[PDB]
Amino acid sequence: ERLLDELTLEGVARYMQSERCRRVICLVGAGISTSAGIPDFRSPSTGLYDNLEKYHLPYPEAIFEISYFKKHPEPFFALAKELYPGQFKPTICHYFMRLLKDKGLLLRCYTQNIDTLERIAGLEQEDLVEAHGTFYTSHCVSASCRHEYPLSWMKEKIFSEVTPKCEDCQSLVKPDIVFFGESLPARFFSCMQSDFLKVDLLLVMGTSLQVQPFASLISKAPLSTPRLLINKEKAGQSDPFLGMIMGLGGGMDFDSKKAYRDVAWLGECDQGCLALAELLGWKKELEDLVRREHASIDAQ
Ligand SMILES: Cc1cc(C)nc(SCC(=O)Nc2ncc(Cc3cccc(OCc4cnnn4[C@H]4O[C@H](COP(=O)(O)OP(=O)(O)OC[C@H]5O[C@@H](n6cnc7c(N)ncnc76)[C@H](O)[C@@H]5O)[C@@H](O)[C@H]4O)c3)s2)n1
Ligand SMILES: [Zn+2]
């Protein structure tokens, strides 16, 4: 009944190399972009949540909240200037997901990341669910207008510290990211219902699984589907405690005596992906891909 012969990266690589493993879903968060120079949200001291006091918020989550944004957008746009990536070079982890695409194993990448690195690494719109939107485009917030603006326009407003107003109607222009309180893209639900029927392997990388409904995705997979977490620390566990994110019952079981399908490889995402690629015979392909794409970016 158990699909992994052993609860290890080697077990997952052998499963991946079997014919049952045809459809892989990746679930990724900010941890897969930290080696690209983009700090994450919840790491102590460097993460965003430990760097909010200077914005003088009524509480730290306000800067994520759509109703607060609509009333006082200036903190969000000051933060956006502070965190604007100085360069957009995707990581080994991103290019591993690109290799999964090129080899026909990637059914979908569900990303929480707003930095657009998945696109730059070559995942196309069909391969991707940007579950929490991206900074790539922005829209006027007036339902009667909804004029679109490209990242170059938004970037100029952010760096000039001018609050972005729509050129046609002078309402606020918001990046197409999903704030706390907003609905997720409809693509998220349509793809979820189709993808999680088919998935043979769930790859979870670089996320604390602290945000719903995205974190519910790990429970949408069939109960035999193996789940591999590559992350600096365990996350999404089912162990109940007050303030757990997971609905009760759902969650990962790495360590109980009933554990049967969940693997935690604890370390840096780039190293874990390099180790998995090596076990699969993809290490040189992945290394060459990173080198070539990185040089291509370095030229301009
Ligand atoms: C083009 C462009 C222009 C700009 C201006 N900016 C960017 S980009 C830079 C950025 O920020 N700009 C920002 N501007 C404004 C911001 C504020 C904001 C407001 C509203 C919504 C926002 O966004 C959507 C959203 C809504 N609600 N939440 N969100 C986001 O927040 C969640 C984060 O949750 P996540 O799980 O992703 O991250 P974590 O909690 O930090 O956990 C990481 C885990 O990885 C582990 N780990 C770490 N490093 C590792 C490594 N190397 N190897 C292995 N493991 C590693 C670590 O130990 C831990 O376990 C997520 O849902 C996301 O959508 C944002 S922010 N691009
Ligand atoms: Zn407008």
In angstroms, rounded to a whole number, what is the distance separating the alpha carbons of residues 286 and 266?
21
Among 267, 236, 231, smallest CA distance to 251 is for 236
Resolution (A): 2.0
Ligand 1 centre from 34 Cα, in Å?
Answer: 9
Which ligand is nearest the CA of 166, by number? Answer: 2
Contact 90, 289 (CB under 8 A): no
Contact 157, 163 (CB under 8 A): yes
Residue 69: CB within 6 Å of ligand 1? no
Residue 235 Cα: closest atom of ligand 1: 60
CATH ID of 1-34+91-131+186-300, from 3.40.50.1220, 3.40.605.10, 3.40.630.30, 3.40.1170.20? 3.40.50.1220
Residue 116: CB within 6 Å of ligand 1? yes
Task: For the sheet with 128-130, list strands across it.
Answer: 128-130, 106-111, 24-28, 201-205, 227-231, 262-266
Structural domain boundaries in the chain: 1-34+91-131+186-300, 35-90+132-185
Q: Does the annotation mark 132 as catalytic?
A: yes
Chain mean position to CA 18: 27
Which ligand is nearest the CA of 92, by number? Answer: 1
Instruction: Check 56, 72, 94, 132 and give the catalytic one.
Output: 132
Ligand 2 centre from 215 Cα, in Å?
Answer: 33
| Cβ neighbours of residue 208 closer than 8 Å, sequence gap 6 or more | 29, 31, 41, 42, 235
Ligand 1 centre from 175 Cα, in Å?
Answer: 15
Please name the residue that has the structure tokens 């001018």: 162
In angstroms, rounded to a whole number, what is the distance separating the alpha carbons of residues 39 and 100?
25
Q: Which CATH superfamily is domain 35-90+132-185 in?
A: SIR2/SIRT2 'Small Domain' (3.30.1600.10)
**Cis preceding linkage at 213, omega within 30:** yes
Ligand 1 pocket test, candidate residues 114, 120, 276, most atoms within 8 A of CB: 114
Ligand 2 centre from 240 Cα, in Å?
Answer: 46
Q: How was this structure determined?
A: X-ray
Residue with the smallest CA separation from ligand 1 atom 20 is 64
Strand residue runs (E) in the chain = 24-28, 106-111, 128-130, 133-140, 148-150, 173-177, 201-205, 227-231, 262-266
